[PDB]
Design a protein around this nucleic acid. Structure first.
Lengths: 185, 221, 141, 83
RNA sequence: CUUUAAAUCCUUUAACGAGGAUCCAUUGGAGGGCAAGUCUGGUGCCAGCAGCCGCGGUAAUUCCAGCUCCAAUAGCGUAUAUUAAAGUUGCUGCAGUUAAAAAGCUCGUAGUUGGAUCUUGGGAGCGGCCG
């Protein structure tokens, strides 16, 4: 008799075939072009895309003019619009299945800060996300696996306590300044 | 070097008179020159090697071994192919396999699953193929689910241009030749099926022989 | 199926029942004879004591002699012939010591070129055999 | 197949047997695009127009092709009804 | 500073805290399945490896060591109970001439299954026969 949670789900799945060529090569290709870390990232994104596709298939297998189907269809369509993967021009229930894994990987905060121009390189982008430097709507973020919503896009900038954002100099710079003042003093 | 015809088919595809191969599959007319495929199907046709299995005899003096080269072929938007060749060594077997795979070419028709939107991506009906003990089934699939099969019919379906299918196999699957021939027979029976779409009673277009006999009676006799 | 009626269930019950007991894996997993014959008593691992070390020969297509340990168990007390796995490890296990006997992989079957032996040794004297092999831990004498 | 845009996505329309209403495939070599000529109306000559027919391999395989060509010629009117 | 019954944990924040970042990432493998050396040394049916096939008999692409390599990565390997793969327990959905499999044959009570047939059609209208 304790008041605990006991709720947990696995976010990744392992494929049936462990050793072959083509899928391993293309996952390595995606990790290379998007600056990810390991295979659990692409396994997680493939699992959540498979869950979205399974929900879309369960919605599509029922008949038209059922209002439960209409409610979950409109809610899921508005969610995929609000993430920013699907466009507002094509908002129908059959366009869910016409999606790829790179569209889900494109809304990553790492790729967004890389393509915004504030980060020079994608490895530098992931480092700078981990480095406590950015802020989104005046709130700093450590985590590169941050799904950015479409409207919270213009409010990405360095934090006020960042040396690149104007403020206190860095620890290495102040150490070298202390050494220079000691040597010249 | 420069290709000279044997039948009148090479003549009619050489003097720029046949528009495409689609009328040749329309008239159910056999193609027995593999370089017509080279002329009309361009660089989109790509090649792969399925399995190199040696077979051997038994005489007084040793076992005379010969290679059996299994090669399928097909451009990624439309047509497929399959070739079985058995020669002495491996290189001539491979070359004969790619020639025979360019010879036996069936086209495939791509259909839809349930909803009818956009470009086709799926087998239009539950087709099947049988040879030996292999039973290869092709079940229509929703969009974007990928190929769900064994590796070599996955290869045949991605060079078929069909992106989304479900399969179900039965029998001694370990024999690659029978399994590949069964999925080739399954994928060849796509047009060999009657659907409500095909209910329009078509008119019979005049044969290319019937309109180019005025040239092939005077060129070659 | 064969009986393809609507108001019939009992014949299909009894037939699927009896033809399921006519299997061999279901008859192994659901009778007390297979559990009684197994010396572990349903356990995955089991501890025993060394009492004599006997080597056994190989099978026909490969010719060698394989060194083995004969172990009397603690929980049951029956004579079971184990097998020390790695190279140069019979000098690590001597008379009257504590060993951890485990299965070898084929669900209680004789495996490979070792006749009549189905169990191996993974731990001796409460220290792992892999660290004794690699030389990272020393056996306490 | 039709489509929502009104554009046929068919790449080639396959022909159909005139006897058993079946479809002749791409790699069937036992099929004939038969052409039958009609007489000129006045005395005996040839006009130039054609009366075309088709048949699949299975009907010739079981051998009922003469019956089918008689029924098709009688339906188009080449052979009289008394026969 | 904060938290809390008072603490520890977390967040915030002074002073410290890196260059060969020694502030050192392991775990099982490299013949086929099964991704990855015909590289270099040693014993050369002994030692051993190997879930299966097999590899060791004096140029071992399978043993024991070095280098290189590949798979996941704060994780990885082994054993046992179980599930999908098993359309090898088959209701969807197995097989019974020769590969495992039709009682020697007939009758017969329980059990299962069971031939046809009993009510049609129209009207005013929504409109240029039918929803």
């Amino acid at each position: 008799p304790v008041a605990r949670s006991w709720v947990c789900r696995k976010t990744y799945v392992t494929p049936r075939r462990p050793f072959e060529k083509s899928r391993l090569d293309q996952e390595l290709k995606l990790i290379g072009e998007y600056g990810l870390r390991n295979k659990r990232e692409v396994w997680r994104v493939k699992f959540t895309l498979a869950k979205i596709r399974k929900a879309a298939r369960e919605l599509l297998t029922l008949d038209e003019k059922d209002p439960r189907r209409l409610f979950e269809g409109n809610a899921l369509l508005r969610r995929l619009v609000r993430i920013g993967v699907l466009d507002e021009g094509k908002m129908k229930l059959d366009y869910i299945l016409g999606l790829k894994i790179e569209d889900f990987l494109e809304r990553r905060l790492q790729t967004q800060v890389f393509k915004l121009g504030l980060a020079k390189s994608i490895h530098h982008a992931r480092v700078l996300i981990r480095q406590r430097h950015i802020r989104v709507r005046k709130q700093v973020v450590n985590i590169p696996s941050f799904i950015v919503r479409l409207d919270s896009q213009k409010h990405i900038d360095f934090s006020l306590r960042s040396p690149y954002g104007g403020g206190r100099p860095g620890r290495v710079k102040r150490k070298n300044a202390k050494k220079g003042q000691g040597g010249a003093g | 070097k420069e290709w000279l015809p044997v039948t009148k088919l090479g003549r009619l595809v050489k003097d720029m008179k046949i528009k495409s191969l689609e009328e040749i599959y329309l008239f159910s007319l056999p193609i027995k020159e593999s370089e017509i495929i080279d002329f009309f199907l361009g660089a989109s046709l790509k090649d792969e090697v399925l399995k190199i299995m040696p077979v051997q005899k038994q005489t007084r003096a040793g076992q005379r071994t010969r290679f059996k080269a299994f090669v399928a072929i097909g451009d990624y938007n439309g047509h497929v192919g399959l070739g079985v060749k058995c020669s002495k060594e491996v290189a001539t077997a491979i070359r004969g396999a790619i020639i025979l795979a360019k010879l036996s070419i069936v086209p495939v028709r791509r259909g839809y699953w349930g909803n009818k939107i956009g470009k086709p991506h799926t087998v239009p009906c539950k087709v099947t193929g049988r040879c030996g003990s292999v039973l290869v089934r092709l079940i229509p699939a929703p969009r974007g689910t990928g190929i769900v099969s064994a590796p070599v019919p996955k290869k045949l379906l991605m060079m078929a241009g069909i992106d989304d299918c479900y399969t179900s196999a039965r029998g001694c699957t370990a024999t690659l030749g029978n399994f590949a021939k069964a999925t080739f027979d399954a994928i060849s029976k796509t047009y060999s099926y009657l659907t409500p779409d095909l209910w329009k009673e078509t008119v019979f277009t005049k044969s290319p022989y019937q309109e180019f006999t005025d040239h092939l009676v005077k060129t070659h006799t | 199926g064969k009986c393809r009626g609507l108001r019939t269930a009992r014949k299909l019950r009894s037939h699927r029942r009896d033809q399921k007991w006519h299997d061999k894996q279901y008859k192994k997993a659901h009778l007390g004879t297979a559990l009684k014959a197994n010396p572990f008593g349903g356990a995955s691992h089991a501890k025993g004591i060394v009492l004599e070390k006997v080597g056994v020969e190989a099978k026909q297509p490969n010719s060698a002699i394989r060194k083995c340990v004969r172990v009397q168990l603690i929980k049951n007390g029956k004579k079971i012939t184990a097998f020390v796995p790695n190279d140069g490890c019979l000098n690590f296990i001597e008379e009257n010591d504590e060993v951890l006997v485990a299965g070898f992989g084929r669900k209680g079957h004789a495996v490979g070129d070792i006749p009549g032996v189905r169990f191996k040794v993974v731990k001796v004297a409460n220290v792992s055999l892999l660290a004794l092999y690699k030389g990272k831990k020393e056996r306490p004498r | 197949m039709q489509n929502d845009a009104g554009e046929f996505v068919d790449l080639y329309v396959p022909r159909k047997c005139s006897a058993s209403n079946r479809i002749i495939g791409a790699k069937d070599h036992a099929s004939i695009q038969m052409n039958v000529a009609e007489v000129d109306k006045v005395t005996g000559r040839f006009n130039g127009q054609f009366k075309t027919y088709a048949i699949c391999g299975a009907i010739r395989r079981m051998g009922e092709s003469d019956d089918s060509i008689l029924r098709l010629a009688k339906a188009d009117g080449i052979v009289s009804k008394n026969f």
